[PDB]
Every structure is written in C-alpha cells, then in structure tokens.
Amino acid sequence: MGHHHHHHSHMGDGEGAGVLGLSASAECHLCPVCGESFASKGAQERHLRLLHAAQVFPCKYCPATFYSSPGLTRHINKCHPSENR
Ligand SMILES: [Zn+2]
Ligand SMILES: [Zn+2]
C-alpha cells in the first residue's frame, strides 16, 4: 500500500532570442569534454555530437549516443540487431 511517484519532471522553461545582459544559466547540464554551463539538455548533447564527438560514440542508426566505445557496438548487437547496413 502507498505506491506513489514523485513525478515533478518539468524539463524545459526557456523561449527567446537576442543578447545577454548577465552571464545567466547554471551548471545543470555540461558537455563532458568542455566545462560549459547549459540550462537546456539538448544544448549539452549538440555540443558533443557536433564538436566534442571524438569522445562520445553515437550508434548511427539511432540518436542514442554512448559515452564508451563497447556500448556503441552493444546497441547494434543487442538493441538494434536488424541494422547491419
Ligand atoms: Zn563541448
Ligand atoms: Zn542503436
């Protein structure tokens, strides 16, 4: 009895464009290869898959990006076993 979730998951909150009058953001999401404060989580992922993609290994058929070399092939073997193109 008392099976309950604490689901306060509300990730986002940020719409706008322009300059900045103050540093803003915080150490919430960091691109693991360069210490740089991202508020948005997609901002962390994009700084990897574009620039800092040497350290991270993306299983090419899906956007599931690994942070290790064995994990790369382990998707294609286990969780993506139709994809040998
Ligand atoms: Zn980076
Ligand atoms: Zn995959």
Side-chain angles (χ1 to χ4, degrees):
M1 187 289 175
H3 63 95
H4 55 256
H5 296 254
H6 60 268
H7 183 278
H8 195 84
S9 303
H10 191 264
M11 304 187 301
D13 302 273
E15 200 298 290
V19 298
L20 64 169
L22 181 63
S23 303
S25 187
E27 296 164 78
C28 305
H29 295 286
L30 306 179
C31 171
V33 194
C34 72
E36 178 168 52
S37 302
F38 304 109
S40 304
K41 189 270 296 179
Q44 170 186 28
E45 302 177 291
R46 77 196 305 140
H47 219 276
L48 291 173
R49 77 92 180 177
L50 292 169
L51 301 178
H52 280 128
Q55 306 302 329
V56 297
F57 297 84
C59 166
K60 58 181 177 179
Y61 307 98
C62 64
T65 307
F66 294 90
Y67 294 75
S68 190
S69 184
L72 176 61
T73 181
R74 292 189 64 171
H75 217 250
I76 302 175
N77 292 29
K78 179 189 178 185
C79 183
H80 230 166
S82 55
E83 301 301 280
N84 279 26
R85 189 182 185 240

